[PDB]
């Protein structure tokens with residue numbers, strides 16, 4: 001009775017919108033494929049529907065770091081078994097990781113904590129795979145770890161893990177030694193068995209391991225992992241991204257001068273013959289012809305001298321896939337220069353499943369749209385179908401079903417193959433009270449979208465302004481066609497781009513105003529939070545860098561607010577266009593002059609969230625005025641260290657709040673249409689209520705709560721955004737950090 005069964009569905013983007021660093025084919029069962037993401041868990045392919053199914057949605061609030069999937073192994077002896085190395089950061093933003101194991105292809109999981117951290121969202125996450133199953137004795141697993149933890153091993157099918165103390169090199173390369181992100185050793189890079197050196201039921205004797213160490217990076221054991229030696233004659237100076245052993249006995253290895261996924265300004269490709277020990281340089285480009293690492297590496301299992309590699313990263317005009325059908329002796333490019341600047345192409349891009357991937361720009365030879373990709377650190381050829389290719393980019397999964405057209409003078413048709421994947425991080429959600437859109441999102445990396453049919457990919461990328469990330473979006477409650485979004489324009493690429501966008505048609509079309517907040521010395525870089533007055537007659541912009549500014553001219557000019565500290569959270573009254581609210585460091589503020597001046601209120605007991613030791617995603621502040629009721633504000637957030645955590649309610653414009661005693665912890669608050677027989681809007685919250693973490697709805701102003709999610713639909717650290725629907729009672733829209741946006745209704 002504490003729960004209400006709901007149907008949870010993804011708001012469809014078609015492309016996914018995030019980085020897919022690894023795609024893993026089972027070596028024994030055709031059409032068994034998995035995909036791992038850096039912040040959004042993993043997926044299993046459904047061959048009958050050409051779509052992906054999440055195997056991570058039971059990851060919840062406390063174990064949120066399991067959605068950083070640093071490695072994944074699928075069992076070739078029993079294809080029902082799959083394993084993941086999970087954990088998101090190896091710095092102070094996260095705790096220790098774990099090895100997860102499933103006997104039902106990811107439907108259910110068991111977990112073994114590791115005594116160190118796993119880095120699903122760390123540098124080098126596309127190198128791999130760093131978790132592998134012995135293909136002759138599948139109770140044996142090896143894990144190549146980060147931060148100097150070295151090589152680890154399981155002999156009980158992943159239940160317990162031990163360090164392989166005889167492995168001689170834990171890594172030496174560090175990407176960002178001066179930063180607090182990526183200042184640890186990248187560690188080991190990939191592990192590859194030689195299946196021919198064992199038989200069924202007996203441990204495979206030869207194991208290759210790549211290590212992020214420019215001086216000596218490739219190691220081999222020939223006694224089942226007891227002793228290790230660096231391969232004689234191996235090249236130095238680079239970092240091997242992948243090592244794949246063909247049935248001809250040749251080990252192919254891609255190298256970059258970084259671990260990726262964003263860098264890579266020099267690279268090589270080598271092959272090593274396991275019989276002779278001879279190394280051959282098969283780099284597709286060398287010298288000044290090469291300004292990029294090589295990342296993805298795909299062998300063709302059905303034609304073992306065919307292989308492909310991808311640049312990482314060439315950037316301009318696009319990335320390159322190189323294909324060889326003769327063991328790397330000669331390469332073909334997926335595109336070539338014609339009469340410069342014109343190019344010729346061996347591929348055709350199909351983004352009909354996610355048309356916004358053109359970013360609202362017309363394609364040219366020098367600025368293609370959509371691009372072949374970027375951050376292409378992983379490339380796969382289906383081991384049971386040489387015509388099927390898949391690769392991840394920073395935004396989607398691309399693939400082809402007619403790859404061999406490359407070899408016969410035809411055109412490889414490349415299409416979005418990310419159906420069912422949702423990987424965006426949700427910075428904001430609004431559900432407009434009128435018009436054809438029930439949901440407009442503010443997203444990282446792909447800006448956000450105005451959704452109409454929630455099952456149809458958006459057709460229109462957000463442009464003029466066009467930016468990577470929308471940090472905040474609001475609308476005028478009484479004139480809902482007027483709305484404002486703020487982000488961070490790339491003014492080196494487009495010096496005239498603005499970090500604020502304005503719409504007068506409910507988010508279909510945007511324009512950029514004439515100016516931005518400035519303190520005489522510096523113009524804001526953007527981001528922060530935006531709030532729109534109830535009538536749309538002013539904008540309040542709490543910038544990320546130079547404090548709070550307001551505009552009475554829809555952004556044509558800006559003036560610094562007074563009384564509200566820089567970095568404050570802000571919210572507009574949904575009735576009184578003169579009233580704004582602010583919050584910073586435990587103090588609540590009110591403005592009654594359209595955002596020009598703020599005054600602290602006596603509201604006490606609010607958290608400061610200044611606690612030392614809080615991880616970046618640990619604490620939240622969520623503050624919203626109620627549509628249709630002046631001076632009605634709800635406030636959620638806090639933390640357990642200050643012992644100030646929960647849900648507060650004010651009905652006197654923030655002069656005082658009541659802390660609801662029946663809500664132990666709360667992190668987000670949102671509103672939706674009132675229940676039948678009720679006059680007050682339904683409340684939607686992310687909270688811990690009577691010992692239960694989840695998503696809750698109240699139809700009686702917070703007196704009683706019912707859980708509307710369940711243990712199979714948790715979506716990790718869901719402190720990003722939430723709102724109900726002013727036109728649909730029971731409907732909730734839930735943002736995530738890695739699983740896109742969900743919407744849910746009673747079953």
Ligand SMILES: [Mg+2]
Nearest residue numbers: 022023024378
């Ligand atoms: Mg792969």
